[PDB]
Design a protein around this ligand. Structure first.
Ligand SMILES: [K+]
Ligand SMILES: [K+]
Ligand SMILES: [K+]
Ligand SMILES: [K+]
Lengths: 367, 367
């Protein structure tokens, strides 16, 4: 009999990769220069994004079914670890089969293969449960609504890291200048060939900063959480799903726009994505406050030395994204600039959030 | 003051992604049909593999410098977490700058940019240390040779998961049949279009199984480890570096070979890669046995109820890979088959290793 901690961490990493696989085709799409193509190149993008959102959800469901199974199987052995490897293998085929089923709706083979994948997942999990129940010492003591927060944090960590490094992976794979291109199109100066790739570096910088600071807010929240509810789990799943789309937003807001209207639309889309990624993070906190005596540590209750700080940490991005979006409709002429300032101001406000919250709590104390 | 566990886990995930970035260009290379191209298409591959091996090492060094810093900083805060995000950002640029420096050796800009990346890493770490020493309560109690095994396990887990799902990611991105191709080249049958992609699925199956079982051996070892030494860390780093090349081996041993000699050479290469990935795993155990009273739990000492099982679990792959390689030179005609049998036999031998070890310990007990 052995501890199951590391095996479940490995499973979480695999499940994060599998839930985020379908973001790569979305982010590998190109911006068409010919406007005649726009329509088509829009349609495809949408069809990809939808396939991502569904896929990330389906895998997440599997992840949940996993998390819950090994709350019934508290301890592992060699056979259980190997069968869990088998279950991970089966889960790894869900995205491909789902994409196949949606790409060929009329062909019956895709539905058949997706159903076979799901059935195989079920069979492997049944085998695990039967093995554990034939060796009762592998079952949890309570076996011999709640959701394990360790699994939640590991899954979220993996998703955040993938989304943060997505664009640097592409930069390393594709945008390393060729001596040939440097000798033909840039007159021999590698500085020029690298300057012609600056927009992609800007996109990666912005995306990494925003994703990492959203992870910072998530980490601050779950440091103060006692028990994670399935409601909080669904809210986190939605938040991560929308986090996945930040690299695309920053890749479009950094590429060239033929007309200013396009840049304004891009800013609006990016602000909407950030707001969606952050409002569900705030909703986790608000829902947890419904039953604070069980879900939160005493410090972050109504009347604690971390309640207001926590509220600020979770309400910063929603407010700033909403303000930028509003600027796109009220101060349009100064809107694109405001967004850029956000990218600098929001980090600083995190490095001084203690100070800013104290100042705001004193101002209203003298007003 | 807050616990630093999750922040370090997030850092480990990021560092694993960054250390494995350069395996993608190796695995995205194609097999040339024209033999005249072979030479060139060989050279490029080598130049890629080298760049991988160096890169994985450099990042690993950074990882080590990280692991060690936050053994001096036992507890974290908001500022420290944000500065750690900055340090991760800086580490994330090392592969690109190193590839740039090796691609343009004569241009001085690449050396300059790589040095700037390293210098920035150093500056951020100095800032972290100064912050911790100006707030002594953030320093470890011993501050107010050994290597943290938690970090080692997290890093290894991430690398293993990435290498295991590498090929399924490509299958999802590229090898989903197009209705167009199905209507033009496969006569409308999606079953045929999918059968024309079977080799890639076979490669993924084999690679995932082998990587996961190597992870199983690693997990079994480190369940029985007390303190991890830097010698063991270097051995693990070498093992993971060679693990990274398993997808390429399985992608070449499953593609078409013009002549049988090519298939034999491919089998030899794959066996060599597996042997390298596994012999350093066994070397970790052998080195730990040098000082068993400190590095290992009492069960796996010389004279325990897990010593022989552990030896078998770590010596299975080296022996089987060596045996297959030998078959390539003694039973050449039956060599390619033997390798395939290995892919089935080695998993089964893990599901029955208790039984097999008992039988072998009784046989020699009556001989
Ligand atoms: K973990
Ligand atoms: K990826
Ligand atoms: K971890
Ligand atoms: K990748």
């Amino acid at each position: 009999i052995q501890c199951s901690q590391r095996m479940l961490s490995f499973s979480d990493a695999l499940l994060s990769i599998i839930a985020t696989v379908m973001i790569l085709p979305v982010t590998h799409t190109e911006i068409s220069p010919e406007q005649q193509f726009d329509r088509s190149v829009q349609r495809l993008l949408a069809t990809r994004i939808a396939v991502y959102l569904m896929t990330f959800l389906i895998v997440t469901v599997a992840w949940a079914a996993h998390t819950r199974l090994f709350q019934v199987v508290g301890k592992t052995d060699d056979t259980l670890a190997l069968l869990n490897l088998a279950c991970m293998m089966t889960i790894t085929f869900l995205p491909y089969t789902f994409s196949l089923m949606v790409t060929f709706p009329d062909v019956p083979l895709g539905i058949f293969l997706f159903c076979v994948c799901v059935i195989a997942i079920g069979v492997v999990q049944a085998l695990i449960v039967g093995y554990a129940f034939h060796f009762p010492h592998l079952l949890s003591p309570q076996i011999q609504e709640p959701l394990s927060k360790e699994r939640v944090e590991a899954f979220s960590d993996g998703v955040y890291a993938i989304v943060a490094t997505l664009l640097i992976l592409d930069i390393c794979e594709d945008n390393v200048p060729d001596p040939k291109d440097v000798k033909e199109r840039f007159s021999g100066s590698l500085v020029a060939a690298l300057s012609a790739t600056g927009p992609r570096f800007l996109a990666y910088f912005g995306s990494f900063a925003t994703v990492g600071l959203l992870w910072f807010a998530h980490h601050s929240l779950f440091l103060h959480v006692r028990k994670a509810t399935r409601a909080m789990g669904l809210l986190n799943t939605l938040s991560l799903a929308f986090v996945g789309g930040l690299p695309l937003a920053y890749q479009q807001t950094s590429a060239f726009a033929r007309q200013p209207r396009d840049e304004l639309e891009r800013v609006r889309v990016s602000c909407t994505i950030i707001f969606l990624a952050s409002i569900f993070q705030l909703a986790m906190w608000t829902t947890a406050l419904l039953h604070q005596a069980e879900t939160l540590q005493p410090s972050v209750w109504f009347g604690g030395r971390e309640h207001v700080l926590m509220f600020a940490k979770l309400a910063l991005y929603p407010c700033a994204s909403l303000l930028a979006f509003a600027s796109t409709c009220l101060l349009s002429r100064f809107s694109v600039g405001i967004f850029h300032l956000m990218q600098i101001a929001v980090p600083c406000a995190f490095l001084l959030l203690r100070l800013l919250v104290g100042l705001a709590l004193a101002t209203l104390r003298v007003l």
